[PDB]
Amino acid sequence: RNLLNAYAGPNALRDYFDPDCQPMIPLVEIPQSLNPFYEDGVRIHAKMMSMHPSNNVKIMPALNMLTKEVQPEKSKTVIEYSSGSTVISLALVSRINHGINDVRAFLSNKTSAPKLRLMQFFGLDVTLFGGPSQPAPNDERGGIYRARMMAREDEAILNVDQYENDANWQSHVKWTGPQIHEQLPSIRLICAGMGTSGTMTGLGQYFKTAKPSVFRLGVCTAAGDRVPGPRSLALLSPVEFPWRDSVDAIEEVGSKDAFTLSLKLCREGLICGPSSGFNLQGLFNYLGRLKAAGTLSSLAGPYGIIDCAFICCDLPYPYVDEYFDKLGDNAFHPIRNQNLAAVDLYRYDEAWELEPSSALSHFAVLLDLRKPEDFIMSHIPGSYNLPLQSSNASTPSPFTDAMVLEKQWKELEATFTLDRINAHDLSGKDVYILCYNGDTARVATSVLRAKGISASSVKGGIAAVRKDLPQMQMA
Template sequence: MQTRNYLNVYKGPDALREYFNPEIAPPLPLVELPESLNPYHQDGVRIYAKMMTMHPANNVKAMPALNLLQHGVTPDKTKTVVEYSSGSTVISMAMISRVFHGLDDVHAFLSNKTTAAKLRLMQFFGLNITLFGGPSQPEPNDERGGIRAAYRLARESESVLNPDQYDNDLNWQSHVRWTGPQILEQLPEINLICAGMGTSGTMSGLGSFFKEQKSSVFRLGVCTAAGDRVPGPRSLALLAPVNFPWKSSVDHIEEVASHPSFSLSLQLCRNGIVSGPSSGFNLQGLFQFLEKRKREGTLAELAGDDGQIHCAFLCCDLPYQYIDEYFAKLGSEYFPAINNSELGEVDLYRYDSAWEKEPLAALADFYRVNNVLDRDILLFMCKRQSDERQGWEQILSPCSDTIIVDLRQPDDYDRFSLPGSVNFPLVQSGTPSPFSDPKVMVQLWKELEARLESNNEDICSRLRDKHSLIMCYDGDSARVATSVLRAKGYTADSTHGGIQAIEKMAPKVENYSGQQGFESYHGQSMSSVSH
């Protein structure tokens, strides 16, 4: 027996192997459920979750995968591993093949009814995937299914290993070797062990172990209710052709439906026991059994010397790859509503702080007068009426490769606007910021999208091949417009604070008009310049 590494620190060339090795790593946690999650607490029942998800491979199938490969891989001969698996087993095999045996070529044979999320998860872990039609859980001996296809592929080449989790006793023996001893060491007072039955390997192993080591332990197996489906476990009918010794390894079988399995899993997760639907499935099976014994008046018969009933169930999977199934199975009433959900379909493009410039920096980028821009002159011209500015816009117009687009209403544009800018009215004065009012964002973003969809739009032809500065009242609507324009391939910027920020900077010069007024003002004041 190897020494356990209770500090849980792994170093050196064998660090990963030791990390994955259940004989070296500390036992996987066994966590008692709080009273709020245990409806039978007042009946003297204590329930413990065996956190198989805390193995480095994050699922119960890591134990069989490790045992199968340890005894199946032939060094310098095995080049490929192929297994029919719904997910956890073959994902564990992929990691363990690399960590222990240096094998990268692992193939997953699985049902074409596997969810897209699970397929992507397998791709994420580097698995080569082959899909098969027919039942999602084929009988192990059905020559038309993927289980037998994996078997035949291995028979054709000595370099291919099919561990065959469905018919290889090393599957269930892994739980005799590791899982059972861990639980008994952690909870010597255990009275009941509960696990789901897919290949039946887990329950066959645990049931065999406790029959030998502590025969008083009640062994509860859990199967899927007929016609229903929970990821992983099988129905009792589908267990009939399985050759593992599951019948002699259980004292009772509960059949569990999918809805309470997902619901209990959700409840466990929200209370700190992060686990997937087959974990909730196991707990529901335990609840059903305890309730039957309570109604029969035989619950106390399960108690140990301390008068309590210590039950352990396996948490064997994680919820993340099944998130869509939780929503489909349970319905929206189980989940908090999303505020401002209407924003999920708009404002879809990126923002960049470099596109939102401070007013002076923006003006310096878009205006040049003999390479020197007199800020006060420019701001003074902003205050002139549009008909008074026309003559000056030849001098104070944006650079030739730029354009300034003002989204405000015409009356506001005529009162104060940047020389040489063009007016495309899109936003109203006093309208809330699109970042504070979702309805404003939705309307603005959809309007921008619609206007930019057609290349015949005047705005598109004006902006093409130009660096544009988008202006609005407070800068926020222009910021949204900049995001949309950038996503469509235009070069666009906005200003922080919009026209309001520029208006506050404008020189307080009144009663000047036309050329004479400008010359008089220009002679009196030449403030600091900005590029």
Template sequence: MINSSEKMTNVNERNVYFGTDSLKKYFDPDCQPPLPLVELPPHLNPYHQDGVRIYAKMMTMHPANNVKAMPALNMLESSVVPNKTDRIIEYSSGSTVISMSMVARVMHGVNDTRAFLSNKTSDAKLKLMQFFGLDITLFGGPSQPEPLDERGGIQNARRMALESETIVNPNQYENNNNWQSHVRWTGPQIFKQLPEINVLCAGMGTSGTMTGLGTYFKGVKPSVSRLGVCTAPGDRVPGPRSYALMRPVEFPWKAAVDTIEEVGSSESYTHSLNLCREGLVCGPSSGFNLQGLFQMLAKRKAAGTLSELAGPDGTTHCVFLCCDLPYQYIDEYFQKLGEQQFHPIRNEHLKKVDLHRYDESWERDALEVLPQFYGSPRSLAQSPLSEIVLKPQNRVLDLRQKDDFHAWHLPGSVNLPLSSVGPHSPSPFSDPGVLEAQWVELEKIFKDDVLVSDLGRHHVLVVCYDGDSARVATSVLRAKGLEADSVRGGHRALRMYGIGSENPISTTKGPLGATVSVAAVPLE
């Protein structure tokens, strides 16, 4: 990597990464433009009229999509031994070890990253970690164990690394390269982007982010007020810890903060939701940081000391970190915030019906499919319908009502009238109630093993009034493993082609013992 003294001088303005090491450059902050710093519009900033401007530092825009990418880069750079290290092990609730797995592959060619974490981790987060190729081991006990507790996964990972020279446990809880990554990269980026900065706000988990940023700004601009945010007692937001759980953390975080705010989960998820809907896509810990900043500003305003934070321009410039993305926490947003925050789903009852796939190739034009089922176009055109015989390997199911079926139908058809299908019934795709009724009825009909077994030996063609109900039926039949198609446009399409005109009717014995009616009309 480029030396930190040269950082920010070789900004890749075009944001393009060339060569065989392009991915390494893409992940390296020294080869990237700085991550975005975005001011909140006034309607998201209740202190705008008080001369406060608030900026989101979008750590989510790193290729690894979270703030833990910087520590992962810095810790692995100093701990992976080339041609020797073949495994990374870390106790992490998600973001840190996911970042490590990507950094290990891209920067060091290490493909085996193993995650130790709490058995209380959500299923969505576990699947996300599996998605990124992590080998997962669960541990019981507290979801956020104390770093030095010998019974927890943190010390288990440490012991395993001590027993093998090829295993590296970066141990984000004790590794100073964790917080120093923000001295190396995040702090300098923010200061170059916003030298007017007056307030800096970050959450406290391992405390690495706040320790690094607080330490950096104490050196370059001591006037910056450094706000650390902890979770409210008894509450939980993914990532940060409560103040009580900060006691055993060995990083010099106390010297890196001036003020601590404690924030609850409801406000955190609410602010995250609002930011996401306005285009700043970020997770609950980002809303958590913003709420902490709001609380501090509110206390200052009530005490009449808000103006003391302002710089020479009379404006207070505040930066809070957006740390991760919301997607892995979607279920928790609904649990924390309630249904009132979300539009209801219309036709939600359809979630339980019409569950099988559709395919355009299963919906066939009449002039294309009828010769396949009855014979060549020449014989169809030259023969009366009463003399046309359904090929033995085929079956035709007609879903229309009995009277309409007996008035006219394709030769050899079997009538399976659906109670929800009539000549004037709306399409199931325009009326959700009709679709629900039809699908339930079709599923019931085709639970008949004898019927399905008989049909399964044939190619099935389904016909209805307008083609749409037959399309639903075809979807059900295909889901049961049958070869089935429907006639696009149904009986109406057949009449449009001149098939199915009103003519005298003769009867014949059809398949499955059904009595069928045959109109003596040519197909063309």
């Protein structure tokens, strides 16, 4: 393995993605505050497959299937139906290891728009498919069957078919398994959610021979629910992988618990996606079933601790919006001064704000935003008055009160229409804004600059020019 984690040469990217060459995928024990069975002697370790450079667990099937199925100088296009993770990993490995840039992605039409934009981001050619979002591999109307049929014709087209290619689950027998066993020699239970079942079958078949005492717990999505990644128990019946020989028990977990635990994991420091909390909740449901039955101590080793390892599949960033939909507004701190998110949209440049000596030197027109009676009493000679209802002498600063910033910016935007700008002939000349303290003036310069007017504000407003330049006659 690369001890320095430094990769150079013409094959740096190849070795960087190589599971045997890179450091082993991190295995981190979760904190005690998140483990409700800690006092019972249960230790839960998270295999952060999201910490692979590809950021998803699908890089192991993708690496193994492409190495096995691709034909040199005979494969020019890769097609695959996926829920997102596999086709991203295929897109990267096809270019890094096989020099193939034509990767076509088949996804359900009901997949979220952020998930869809992420597919285009990685250079994928996406085709949407109606009907079931998770079609059976033998459904002739689903993308899995269509991708496999498009690969039989045009021999350059390759469909590795993650749903029924043995190289899928064999990748976890080759890498994911032999890492957890060495990282956790005292492992008593391995847990993984089943999408294609490749992860769980690989882990289950490996631990079937290596340390047969390890309990193998699979997690499926509850009937009628949906979690990105795994599938329901009904959708796992037709699959031909030996998952029935790779599991010792099955748990069913819903989507609300999955997103809840995923959120709890990310704030602890283990940044992982919804299916990771899905897998952890499945482990919680089984551990509580033995504790309720009093048989939890049967999984313990010579020392009373029970070492459990569960898979964390990907990062939660593409799913962040789904958390707010599935979970309530609780467990999310509301945004303070939320109204500002749509009422101060334009940029501010510190070069627009000038000292009174610098502004009056150029004098080009000068605009005064104070009240008309305050303007009559005293103002800079030669300046135009343009009052505002939201701004008087006693008005608090815009940047100290969220509402008056909402009022002043709106009134400034509504005041500087195309007719009023030409009414003062502001177009094509340097405009200087004057205020009481300069804060309203700086908000005004952010409105005018976005409209093409070369506006500038005087820091301190009329209060600064009187003290900095006492000799200038107000009149």
